[model samples]
Target chain A: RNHRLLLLRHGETAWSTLGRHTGGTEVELTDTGRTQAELAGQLLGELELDDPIVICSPRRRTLDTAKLAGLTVNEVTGLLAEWDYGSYEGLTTPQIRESEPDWLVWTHGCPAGESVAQVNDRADSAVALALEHMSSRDVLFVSHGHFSRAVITRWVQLPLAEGSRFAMPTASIGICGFEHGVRQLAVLGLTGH
Target chain B: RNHRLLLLRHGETAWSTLGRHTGGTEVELTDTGRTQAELAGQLLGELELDDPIVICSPRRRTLDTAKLAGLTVNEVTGLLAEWDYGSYEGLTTPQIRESEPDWLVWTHGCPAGESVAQVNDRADSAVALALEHMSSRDVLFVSHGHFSRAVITRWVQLPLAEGSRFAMPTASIGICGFEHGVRQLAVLGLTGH
Candidate 1:
């Protein structure tokens, strides 16, 4: 309840090893996504976060998964990109349902680009800059996988089509925080050995 | 995407290290909740689930966290208990907001028991008995932590007050599954080493 944010996602690519559709492409990461971003930085170095901040997503597979997860960037921004998919970028929902049948990018987005309310306004401005650097400490970000599950359904305010019920793999790790003051999602899609 | 269910929660009690409320009593497990259920059984023995059908929650801290996670149970059920909290069971959200002021068991329920639509009809009958044994494999339940985040917000149909935006965190391990056919939530609150 004190503070937390940490979303992360970028890693596997080469069209995420086949599931494809990678938005605004410039992919790169395989080699098992840099060994799953150095095992998601050893699960964020066994947690206990405090001086976090970190943000990312200025592409190159989320800045090489925030430099193989040891992370250092304080904010590369593009409001934590990915989810542009104009003209269905590298296609693959069975190759965009072979001309739009049940092609739901959270209810059919990306004909030209963005818009599930413009990726819910860039996931509410990257969740208001990660809740203004989470009031005091933890923040992290390194985003993708459908904009970090659309900033985790806008950090629990939900309905960015509930980020298509969140699947998010590829070097995962989500977290979100606040308890009595509400916004929860303590963790989701976390990965690593 | 073929099938998955998993969920889990129990392990770590003694009113889950100060968060209390513990519905319908019987609590145990707290040597760091049996070492977080043997690291959620080494992350469910590195996941390639197939014959899976587990269930659990006939209490005793979820049948000793499904026998310290190497699982075996096939269906202990009480439809996977915990959420009755009749009269705020063992109290402690600052002792139930010092007698009900801001008391929110997802918008105040426990006066005499359960109702967030009766824990959404036991999380829609434990997501219809884990999707009738997930059609071909992977089911696991082990239970608690607000009825496993109210069966993970009813396996994506959401709104059992969206399971208070999920924060489970006991032994953890969540999952859910299905992709082209929809559902989703792949992994959440996962735990263990």
Candidate 2:
């Protein structure tokens, strides 16, 4: 009676290598990132998924990652995109810390971009879509770090304030499923080869 | 400029196999758990730790796991003991959830045992001890599930209420270190074969 929504974060992009935010930006994966995406696919391929629907972000990075991971991108949407940082886009956390020393994007968010509530609501739709296919199929959501973390936090019924509490390094994977007849997060940010 | 605290959580225990909460409880690891401990040793042995100080809780399970993991228990104390579950000891999450629907050990704690503040304080002490030897010697703290999560959250300066945001499966490992010139949790709950 258990279904799964696998959240496979896209591999490391140029901005990711520099620890910069890549929200709503189209960037290519680094050579190392491509390798990571392939390896991720290799790992998931070993799982032998059945009737999987691989949904990826409209962003180029994720579209490429999904294909490289030996997965076909069935549906691409802005829903799985990274948290739009707006003015803070392309800036690292330290950069933002300079001005708002105690700023937390999870609470304060960015000007003219997605708020925590917005991200949570987006994740809600993503989760609902996954649930639809998951009754008899395994659905994979290829996503970016920040928004993927948002989706996961929402899945567990945790507060949006707890979004930063979860970290998904690029190329990492997490599982949303049931354990012992209870809806629980089976894995969180499990990084592999 | 760098220090590392390696947290080695104990392998599975009897109550763990049955999905029970164990705190201040004496138990033994199963055969599979023993194998997990041995594998943990093999993995840690690969690191070639020099002059490492291994400390474990007084519980036999942790003491045994440390020895199996190729670590000598230099100090045994209640400092690394599992979160004292008090009246809720040995009950699984669902069992407790049936009563307190919104209960979280990180927040609600237990009926009479250590509170969130107390656990954080204990983890603070553990982190301090680990830091003392990390420069010239790596310190490995063999701990239980809940307590390990608490130590990790404390290491990253996160609140005790956010403890469940981090998860430490039995026999898992985590690293505590700095990033971008700030003390941060680098790796968490990295499980071994």
Candidate 3:
């Protein structure tokens, strides 16, 4: 069987709820996040996939969600992280806009942090590795919203900037697979909690 | 070029310094641990590897060490963890021996926690994925000591139970690679601090 990819976004964090950019800092999930993660576990448990290998980012929120979701996770370095926001970390869009008017993260990118292309590159490498490794088994990726969306964009062979088109809610699930030898999106942003 | 695997043990923790078996609980690194991780980062910076991908375990100490080590880490679920010691967590061997005079963690295993074989399985899958994804590049794995030992055992095609034969110190580095198509231990347990 062709390998199937299961993408899971981690549960809500204090920063996520407040529209803050988490960047590379470690943040734990809130109670609601934990509940969402448990629900994600239930959803994942119901899937018909074989002993799918679960991979997660090293961030606390993602790790906790994966464990709560009841998957044995392997930490991938290309996957362990979120975008480094640098100077823009922990700031809301408005806060960012206040300084650089009309600065879109997709087009203009973050200052003193990773450019959109850099994040996309990291995402690209991860997807390539995942595809190469799990060519015959179902695979699960537990990660953050922005990076995961970037991964999906790359999976569909879209431009890195097109990641702006996807929005990942906390504790949501997305799927990408092949149809007629072409990459296709089987699911997008299905809420787990 | 063939892929290189770098196995890194997390820095010092209170339990780590006390020689306690830390499991499941989130533990922070001590100041010395932080220094050790920085030194590890310095060592990593000096390496001539090409665009090496990094993976880390999800535990706090591991995460902290990875960050301090200044490597771009992706938290992968398969690596996000350490051995689950269950009831034996936070207890030293002598303390456990006080309760059961003949209790040995390596041979008898922990109660309500992972067996050596189970940890070995997790390590095996991780190593397999690393080998597959990073065929022509170096890969760095940052994790706890016990699990790191298990990974090396699996890399050498040894049973998980044989991990007891390997000893890893905190903030230490280990290397594995193929020599003439034979998987070989290039280096085992090189202390960074």
Model 2 residue B4 CA deviation (Å) reads 4.3
Better candidate by lDDT, 1 or 2: 1
Chain B TM-score of all predictions, in order?
0.36, 0.94, 0.93
Which candidate, 1 or 2, has the higher TM-score? 2
Docking class of 3: incorrect
Clashing pairs in 2: none
Q: Write down the lDDT that model 2 would get.
A: 0.80
Give the DockQ of candidate 2: 0.21
Quality of candidate 2's docking, in CAPRI categories? incorrect
Per-residue lDDT value at B174 in model 3: 70
Please write out the lDDT profile of model 3 over residues B64-147, one tens digit for every residue: 888898888865664538888989999987888899777655567788998866776788888887887577678899987778
Alpha carbon lDDT at A186, candidate 2: 54
* Candidate 1 chain A lDDT trough over 10 residues, lowest sum: A184-193
Q: For residues B22-120, what per-residue lDDT tens digits would candidate 1 score against the true structure?
A: 876997897888888988887788787898988887779889977887778977868888888887788778888887767678766787888788888
Candidate topping lDDT: 1
Considering only chain A, what is the TM-score of each predicted structure?
0.36, 0.96, 0.94
lDDT of 3 at B26: 86
**DockQ result, candidate 3:** 0.01
> What are the Cα lDDT values of the candidates?
0.83, 0.80, 0.76
lDDT of 1 by residue, A36-84 (tens): 9988988898897898988887888889878887878877978888889
Better of 2 and 3 by TM-score: 2
